[PDB]
Amino acid sequence: CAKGCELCSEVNGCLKCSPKLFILLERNDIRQVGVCLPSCPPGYFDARNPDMNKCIKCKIEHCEACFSHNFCTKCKEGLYLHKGRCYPACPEGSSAANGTMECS
Amino acid sequence: CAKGCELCSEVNGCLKCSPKLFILLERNDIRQVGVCLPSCPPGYFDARNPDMNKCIKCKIEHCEACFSHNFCTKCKEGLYLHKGRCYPACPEGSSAANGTMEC
Amino acid sequence: GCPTHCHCEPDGRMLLRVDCSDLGLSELPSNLSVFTSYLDLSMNNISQLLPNPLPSLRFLEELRLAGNALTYIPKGAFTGLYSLKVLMLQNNQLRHVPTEALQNLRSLQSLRLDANHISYVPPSCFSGLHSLRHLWLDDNALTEIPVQAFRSLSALQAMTLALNKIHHIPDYAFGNLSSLVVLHLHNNRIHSLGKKCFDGLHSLETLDLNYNNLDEFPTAIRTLSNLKELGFHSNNIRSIPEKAFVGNPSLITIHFYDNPIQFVGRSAFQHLPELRTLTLNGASQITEFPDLTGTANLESLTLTGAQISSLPQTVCNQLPNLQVLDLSYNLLEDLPSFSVCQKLQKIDLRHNEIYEIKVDTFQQLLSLRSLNLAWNKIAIIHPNAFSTLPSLIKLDLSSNLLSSFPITGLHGLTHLKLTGNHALQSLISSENFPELKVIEMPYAYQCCAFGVEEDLKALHSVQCSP
Amino acid sequence: GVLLRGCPTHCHCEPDGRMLLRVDCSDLGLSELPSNLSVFTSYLDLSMNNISQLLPNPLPSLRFLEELRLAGNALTYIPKGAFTGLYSLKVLMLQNNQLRHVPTEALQNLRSLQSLRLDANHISYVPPSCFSGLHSLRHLWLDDNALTEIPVQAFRSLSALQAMTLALNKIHHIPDYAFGNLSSLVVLHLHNNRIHSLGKKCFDGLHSLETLDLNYNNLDEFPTAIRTLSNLKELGFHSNNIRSIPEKAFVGNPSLITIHFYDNPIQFVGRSAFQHLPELRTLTLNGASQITEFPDLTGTANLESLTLTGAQISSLPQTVCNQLPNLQVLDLSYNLLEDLPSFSVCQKLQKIDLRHNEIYEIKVDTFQQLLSLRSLNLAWNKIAIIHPNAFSTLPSLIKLDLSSNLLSSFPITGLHGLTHLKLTGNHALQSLISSENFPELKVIEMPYAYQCCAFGVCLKALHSVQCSP
C-alpha cells in the first residue's frame, strides 16, 4: 500500500495508519484523502484514542499551535496568551505582558 | 356548486357530499374525481360512516353487485352464488341450483 | 309508454326500465306504462305515496324511492307488486318501519331502510318475507335490537344495524337468523352483552362490533364456530382472556386496535391455522411471548410496548411463512437464532436491551430486507454476523455503544444508520458500499468519505449526516 | 545568496526570525546525528531516523536551539547531561520511543522548557522529581503509556503546568491531593484509563482548572471530588459505569458550560442536580427510568437544547418555560405525559418531539406564539381532539407528525403551507383533503390511499410529490 499505512484505497487514500501514527484528512475539494504522519502539521493538534489517532484542526480564532480544542498554546504574534485562550487585554489577575507576549 | 355536493374544486371534483349521500371517486388516470350519488353504481357497495359515506369497489372474484367486502350479492351469471361467496360447485348442504343460479 | 322527462330502455326483451330520478316531482305519473320491471324514483321531493298510487305493475322487480320525503307508507301500497325483488327507501324521514305495508312480498330479496329517523320496529312488520336476504338499517335512531321482528327472518343472509344507539344485546337477540352470514353493528353504543347473545346464527362468518362502548371482551363470541372475520376495535376493552378465540378456528382476520389493552393471555391466540396477521401495541402487562400452537400461517407478528425479557430458543418453529417481526419496545437482552424463521423480510427489535449479536443470530435469512436494532446496548457484533444476507438493504444500528463495524456481508445495502455510536470512530470507503443512498454517521469526517444566480442543477447521487 | 547557512547534508533548512536556522533532518534512515551541524540552529527535527544512542558524541553547544524533535527514534534512556548545553530549549519532543521510565536526571534543570512530549512510549515509572527545576513547563504529554499511579511527587515540582494529559494508561485510583501543587493547571485529560476509585479531595489542588476529562473509564459512582473546582468550564465523565447523578451534584461548579455523561447506565438524577448553571448550553438525559418529575432549572435559563427521555414523567409544571427561554430543541419522547402546558414562553423553539406519550388533547394555548417552530412531532399518542386554533400562530411550521393517534378530524386553520405531513394510524380519519390549502407539500403519509390520491399519487424544478397508504 502506502507509507506507514496498514490499509489503503486509491479513492480515499489510507484508511488505517500504523499502530502509532496520526491520520490526516486532506480536504481537496468535495473529496477526502487520508495520510499517516507522526506529528500533525501546523494548525492541527495531535489526538490519541485506542481506536484511532486523528489530527484535529484547531478551531481557535487567532491562534497558531494548540494543545487541543479550546486551549491555545502559541497564540498569534500580535496577541497575548492568558490561560489557553488569547486576548488583546488579559489579567490584571496576576499576569500582564512583560518582554515576550505570554501574559505571565 | 354541483349536484348534491357541498364542497367542490375543479382540480378534484366534489370533496364533501350532502348529509346522506355517498362520495364516488373515479380514477380517470393520474386523477381522481368525486361525485355524490344516493346509491353506488354496479361494482361498488354502499358504506355509511358518521364522518364520510364512500362508494367502495368490490374486490370479490367474478362478482357484479355486492353487500360489502367478502360478501357478494349477485354473482356473475354462469357461476353459483352460495351464501355471500360465489363458486362453480356449491352445497350439497341444502341448496344446489334450480332454475336461476341462486343455490 | 314511458313518462315525460324520464329516460327509459328495454329489459330482457319487452319489459321496460324507467329512470325518473331527480326531476323534482311532486307526485308520480300514472303515465307509467305497465311492463315496467324497473322504476327509479329518487330525490324527487315526494310527500305522499299516494292518494292514487300504482301497483298493477306485476312485472316490477326493483323500485327505488330514495331521497323522497316520506313519513309512513299505506298498508296496501305494495300489494300489486308480486315480482318485487329489490326495494329502496333510504334517505327519507320514516320514524318507524311501516306498520304493515311491507309484510308478505315473497319475492323481495333486498330491502333498504337506512338513513332515516326510525326508532321503532313493529313486531314482525317483516312477516312473510321468506326471500329477504339483505337488510339495511344504517344511520337510524334504534335503541334496542328488534329481536321479535327479526325472528321472522330466517331467510336473511346480510344485515347492518350500524350508526344507531343500541346499547345492549340480550340473549338470543338474533336467535332464529341462522342463515345470516354477515352482521354489522359498528358505531353504536354497546356497553353490555349477554353470555349467549350471539347463540343463534350458526352460519355467521363476519362480525363487526367496532366504534362502540364495550368494557369487556365479548365472550358470547365463543359459539360462533364458523366465524372468519372479527372486529371489535375502537372500544374500551382492557384485556383479552386466556383461550379467548378457541371457539372460532378458521378465523382469518381479527381487529382490536384503538383498544386500551393491558394484558393478553399467551393462550388467547392458539389454534387459528387461518390467521395471517397479529398486532399488539402498548400491552404493558405482557411478560412472555404468546403461545402459537396450531397457528403457523402467521405472515406478520408485531408485539410492542411490553416487558418481554426473553424469547424461547425454538420460537421460529411455529413461525415459518412469517414475513415481518416487530418486538420493539421490550426488555429483550439475549436473542435466539431466527434462522428457522425464513421468509422473514423485516425485523424490528428497536428500543430493547440487546448487548450482543452472534454469528448465527441472523444467518440464512435469504429474504431479509430491513433490520432495525437501534436504541439498544449492542457492544459486540460478530464480524461475520451479516455475512450471509443477500437481500439486506436497510440497517439501523443507531444508539448502540458500538466500537467497531462488520464489512463482511451487507456489501451493498442502501440505508445505513450508525449515529449514537460514539466509539465508532473507524473510517470506511465508498466501495464496499455501492447502492448506498442514505447514511447517518456518528462523526462528520466519516460522512466526507462519501463526497459530502443562473440555472444550477442538483445531480443528487448520495446522502450522509453528522 | 547574501546569507546561506550552514546546514548538514540531505536535510532541508530555512531561516528564522532572521539568521537563526531551522533544520529538518527527519526520516533519512539516519543512525546517529552528524557533526558540523552549524550553530544558530533554532530548530532541529530528528524524527523517524532509527537512532539507538544519544550519543557517544552528542551535540549541545547549540545555545540557540528553540525546539528539538526526537520522535520515532528508538530510545531507552537519556544521558544525564545531553540537554545541558541547550539553554534556550522551549519545546522538547520525545514521543513514540521506548523509554520504560522518565530519564532520572537528563531532563532536570531546563529553565526554558515550556512543552514536553513523553507520550507513546512504554514508560511505567516516573522517578521522584525528574522534573526538578522546570519552572517554565506548561504542557506535559504522558499519553499512551503504562502508568499505574499518579506521579504525585514529580507533579509537586510542577507549579508552572497549564495543560497535562495522562490519557491511555492504567491509572485506576486518584488519591487525595494527587495534583496538589498544580495550581496553574487549566486542562486535565485522564480519558481511556481505568479509574474505579477516587478520593473526596483528589482534585483539591488545581484552583485554576477549567476542563476535566474522565471519559472511557471505570467509575461506579459520581465523582464528588469535583465539588472544589469552582472554575470548571467543561466536564466529561461519559462512557463510565455511573448509575446516578446526586442532588446538588454540580453545585460547586457554576460557570460550567458543557457536561458530558452519555454512555452511562444512569437510572436516577436528582431534580436539583442541574441547578445554578447559568452558562450551560445543552442537557441530554436518555433512559432515566426512575425519573418521575421534571428537573429544576433555577438559575439555568441559557439552555439551548433539552432532552429527557425514557422516564416516568406524568406531568409538567404549568411554569416549565419560565426557566426555559432560549430553548431551541425540546425532546421529551418516551414518557407518560397526558396533559401539556402552554409552551408559549418557550420561544425560539425550533423542534419539538413529544412522541410516544399519553397526550389526549392539544388545547388552544399549547403552542401559541412559537414563531421559530419548524418541526412538531406528536406521533404515537392518544390525541383525539385538536383545538381548531391550536396551530393558528405558527408561521414557521413545516413538519408535522400526528401518526398513530385517535383523530377523526383536523385543524386546517394555520399551517396552510407546511411540507411534511404524517397522519397514518388515525383510523377514524376518513375525511378527504384538497391540494389547495396545502401547497409546498412534498412528503405525506395518509391513513387511506384514496386520500393520498387527492394529491395525484395513483419548471417542476422542485421534484415530484410523495404520499403513502
Ligand SMILES: *[C@@H]1O[C@H](CO)[C@@H](O[C@@H]2O[C@H](CO)[C@@H](O)[C@H](O)[C@H]2NC(C)=O)[C@H](O)[C@H]1NC(C)=O
Ligand atoms: C317539495 O315538496 C313539497 C312538500 O313538502 C311540495 O309542496 C307541495 O307543493 C304543491 C305544489 O307543487 C302544493 O300544491 C302543495 O300544497 C305542497 N304541499 C306541501 C305539504 O307543502 C313542493 O311542491 C316540492 N317542491 C319542489 C320544488 O319540488
Ligand SMILES: *[C@@H]1O[C@H](CO)[C@@H](O[C@@H]2O[C@H](CO)[C@@H](O)[C@H](O)[C@H]2NC(C)=O)[C@H](O)[C@H]1NC(C)=O
Ligand atoms: C325459525 O326459522 C323458521 C321461521 O322463519 C322456522 O322454519 C320453519 O320450519 C318448518 C318445519 O320445521 C317449515 O315447514 C317452515 O317452512 C319453516 N319456515 C320458514 C319461514 O323457513 C323455524 O322453525 C324457526 N325456528 C325456531 C327454533 O323457532
Ligand SMILES: *[C@@H]1O[C@H](CO)[C@@H](O[C@@H]2O[C@H](CO)[C@@H](O)[C@H](O)[C@H]2NC(C)=O)[C@H](O)[C@H]1NC(C)=O
Ligand atoms: C564543519 O566543517 C566545515 C568544513 O567544511 C567547517 O566549515 C568551513 O570549512 C571550510 C572548508 O571546507 C573552511 O575554509 C572554513 O573556514 C570553515 N568555516 C568555519 C566557520 O570554520 C565548519 O566550521 C565545521 N563546523 C563545526 C561546527 O565543526
Ligand SMILES: *[C@@H]1O[C@H](CO)[C@@H](O)[C@H](O)[C@H]1NC(C)=O
Ligand atoms: C533501523 O533501520 C534500518 C534501515 O533504515 C534497518 O536496516 C535496521 O535494521 C534498523 N534497526 C534495527 C534494530 O533493525
Ligand SMILES: *[C@@H]1O[C@H](CO)[C@@H](O)[C@H](O)[C@H]1NC(C)=O
Ligand atoms: C510546588 O513545588 C515547588 C517546588 O519547586 C515549591 O517551591 C512550591 O512551594 C510548591 N507549591 C505549593 C502550593 O505547595
